[PDB]
Symmetry: C5
C-alpha cells in the first residue's frame, strides 16, 4: 500500500485509457457507505465527467458520482439516479462527501462542508462487495468500457470510504481534515493500480 497523503492523481489529458483502479479489502455487502474526495477540473462547464465510479459485475453503476453538464452532481446507486442541482459553479477545488443508507435510502450530499438536502434513493438495496473501483473514467463494464467524453481531466484525491453514514460532525472533521479512520478505502493507506498516462503530484488544494 501507499500513503498518498498530500498527493493527488493528475489526469492531464482527455483519454479513454487514463484511469486508476482502487482495491477495497471488502468482503461483505455494504448496507451503507460514505465516500469523500477532493477533485479539481475545469470540465464542469464544457461536459460531464465521472468523479467516482463503483461497479460490480452485475451492475456497472453500483455507485457513481457524476457531474452532469449544466445540471450538477448526478448521484446514483444501483443505476437509479438523483440530481443535486448546482445552478452555477466557480472554478475551484471542490470537496464532496456523500453517504447512503439502505435502511432508509437517505442520501446525504455535502459540497465544501455544506449539506445538500437529504433525498431518497434505492431504499432497501444492497451494494455488492466484489467491486471494481475506478477513478478518472466512467466504466460501463466491470473494469472497462470507458467513454472518453466521460473521463475526468484534472485531479482527484483524498478518496476515502466508510461502510457507514458519517454523522455531520464527522463530515465536518473530514472537511477540516481532522483525524479520521476510513475502513473501506483509506487514502493514507491505499492499494491501487495505475493504468495509462496518469501522474501522482502534490495536491493543489490545501
Amino acid at each position: 500500500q501507499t500513503d498518498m497523503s498530500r498527493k493527488a492523481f493528475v489526469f492531464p489529458k482527455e483519454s479513454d485509457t487514463s484511469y486508476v483502479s482502487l482495491k477495497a479489502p471488502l468482503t461483505k455487502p455494504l448496507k451503507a457507505f460514505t465516500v469523500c474526495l477532493h477533485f479539481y477540473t475545469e470540465l464542469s462547464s464544457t461536459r460531464g465527467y465521472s468523479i467516482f465510479s463503483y461497479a460490480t459485475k452485475r451492475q456497472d453503476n453500483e455507485i457513481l458520482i457524476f457531474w452532469s453538464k449544466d445540471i450538477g452532481y448526478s448521484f446514483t446507486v444501483g443505476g437509479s439516479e438523483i440530481l443535486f442541482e448546482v445552478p452555477e459553479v466557480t472554478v475551484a477545488p471542490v470537496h464532496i462527501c456523500t453517504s447512503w443508507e439502505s435502511a432508509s435510502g437517505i442520501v446525504e450530499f455535502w459540497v465544501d462542508g455544506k449539506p445538500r438536502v437529504r433525498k431518497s434513493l434505492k431504499k432497501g438495496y444492497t451494494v455488492g462487495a466484489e467491486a471494481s473501483i475506478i477513478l478518472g473514467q466512467e466504466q460501463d463494464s466491470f473494469g472497462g468500457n470507458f467513454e472518453g467524453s466521460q473521463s475526468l481531466v484534472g485531479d482527484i484525491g483524498n478518496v476515502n470510504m466508510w461502510d457507514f453514514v458519517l454523522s455531520p460532525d464527522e463530515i465536518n472533521t473530514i472537511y477540516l481534515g481532522g483525524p479520521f479512520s476510513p475502513n473501506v478505502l483509506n487514502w493514507r493507506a491505499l492499494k491501487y493500480e495505475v493504468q495509462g498516462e496518469v501522474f501522482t503530484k502534490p495536491q493543489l488544494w490545501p
Copy 2:
C-alpha cells in the same frame, strides 16, 4: 417524552402520508404565541409547502406557516393571511421565529435572526387549545385531508412554541441557541407521533 436535541425529522419523499403529529399539553386558549423552528428544503423555487400547520376543529388553518412560490412566507391565523415577501431565496437551512398577539394583532416574523417589519393580523382573535399540530403536511381537516403538492420535503426541527411573544432579545438567544424554556411545545421534551415514511436523523444545520 423524547429529547430531540441535535435531531431533525427528515421527509425525504413527496407524499400525502409522511407527517408527524405533535402533542401540546395545552388547555388554556392562546391569546398569544411564538413558534420557532429550523427547516431545510429545496422546494422553495419549485412549489409551495407547509412549514408548520396548527389546526383546530373549527379552523383547519388556525396557525399556518407556509411558503408560497415566488412570494415567500405566508403567515396566517384564523385563516386570515399576510405575506412576508422574500424576493431572493438561497438554498440554505433557514431558521424562523414568528410571534402573534391578540391584544394588538401584531405579527413579528424573524428569518435567520433578522426581523421582518411588524404587521397587523386578527387583532382580538383567540387561538384554540384543542389543537392538532402537524409537521410535513398541510391539513385541511383536523388531522387529515393533506395535499401532496403542499407537503414538506427535506427537514424540520427545533420546533418550539411559547404562549407569549418572545422579546427580540429572547428571539436573539433562540437564534444563537442560548438557554430557553418553551412552555407549549418543547423540542428537548417533545411528545410526538410519527406516521408513514419519516426518519429522525442528526440535524444538518449546526
Copy 3:
C-alpha cells in the same frame, strides 16, 4: 416624561388616523437643528411615506423628512425641497441623521453612519418654535389633513432633536449609540400623545 429607551412606536396598519404627536419644550425659533431617528418599513418600494413631519401654523412642511418612491429621502425646510437620491435600497432598519443651519443653508444628511454630500437649502430662513411634531403621518394642517397614502407603516424610534448642527463626530456617536443629550426632543425623556391604532413595542433594530 416617558423613557422610550429600547421602545419603538409600531404603526402596523395603513390608516389616516394612526399617529403620535410629540411635544417640544421649545420657544426659541430654531436657527439650526439636527434630527436623528430609527425607522423600519417595507413601504419604500411601493409608495412614499412621511418619516418625520415638523409643522408650524403658517407652514405645514416646516421640516419634513419624506421617502419619495424610487427617488429616496426628500428633505425639505420651509417648503423648499432637496433630494438625497438612493438608487437602490434594501429592507433593513435604517438610521438617519439630518442637520440644517440658517447661517449657511448647509443640509447634512446621514444614513446608517455614512454622510451624504452637503447641499444648500433655505439659507437665512428660520424654523418656528410654535410647532406640532407628528410621527406616522404627514401634516397638511397644523395637526391634521393627513393622507393615508403618505402614512408610515412599520416602526419609528430613537427620535432625537438638537437645536444645533451635530458635528460628524457627534453623529458617529449617535449612530453607535454613545452618550448624548438632545435638548429639543429627547427619546429618553419624551412627551407625546398617542392617537388611534398605535402600539409601543421593543425596538427590532439593536
Copy 4:
C-alpha cells in the same frame, strides 16, 4: 496661515463664482510634484467637474485634475491629457494622490490607496512656479473664466502638494494619514483666500 486640519471647503451650490484660491510659497519651477486630496461630490454621474486646477499665465491647465463624465479622472499637464478610466463609480469620499516627473514623464495616479498603472505624459516639460491654484472651479485664464458646468459641488480637503514624486510607501502613509510634511502646499499650514459663498465645515470623511 490657517491650520485646516479636520476641515473641508464646502461648495454647496453650483456657481461660476464660488472658488478658493490657494497660495504656494513657490519660486522654483517644478520638475516634479505630488498632489493629494479628498473630495466628495455626487456630480460624478451627472457631469464633469474640476477637482484641482493649477494654472500659469502661459497655460491655463498647467496641472488639471478633472473628472470627465462616464470616462473617469482626466489628468493633464501642460495642456496634454491622459485618462485613468473608472467604469464603476460609487458615491463615497474619494482620496486621490497624483505624481508627475519631468525626467520620465511618468504619471502615477492613486485612488483610495490603490495605484493606477503608470502612464507617460509631457516628458521633459516643466511646470511654472508663477501659479494660481483654485479649488472648486476650472480656470481658463490665470484666475478666471470659470464655467459653472465645470465647478465642483460638495467638499474638497486635505489638499497637499510636494515638489517631488512621493514613493508608494509615502503615498500609503498619506492615505492612512501617517506623519508627512508637504513643502509646496500644506493643508496644515495653508495660505488661501475665499471668494463667493464657500463654507469651511468639519470634514465628512474620517
Copy 5:
C-alpha cells in the same frame, strides 16, 4: 548584478523598442522550469501583450507567457500553446507562477496564489539553454522582430526562474514572499540590459 528588490521595470508607452533583456547563467538545457513574476497593465481588455518571452535560435517562442484578448493567459513551450482561460479580469497587479516538466508535460499555472488545473504540454521536450529572455516585447527572432501591438505597457517585476517545478508549498511561499533562492534567474541578483525608454521605479504592488 543589480538587486532589483522593491523595484520594477516600467514600460509607460506602447512601442516596438522598449524592452529589457535578461541574462541567465544557464548552460544545461532545461528539463523543467518555474517562472514567477508580478506584472501590472490595463491592456488586458484592449489587446494582447507579452508578459514573458523566452526564445532560442531554433524557436522564437521557446517559453512564452502571453495574454490573449478576451481569452486569458496563453502559455506555450516549444511553440505549442495552451489557454488558462480567465473569463473576467479586474485591473489590479496580478502575480503569476507557472511551471513545466518534460518528464510529464504537466503545466502548472498559478494566479494570485490560486492554482489553475494542471494541463499537459510538450511532454518529453527540452527547453534550450542558449536563450534570449526579453520583457516588454514578444520575440519573433532571437532578440528581435518585436511587434508593437504585442508589447507590454505598465510594469513587470519580481521576475524569478527556477530550473525545476516548485512545489505548491514553495509557490505559496513565493506569493507570500517568503525566503526563496531562484537558480536560473534571480530578481535579487539580476543581470540585464535596458534598451529604449524603460524606467526602474519602486514597485506599486506590495
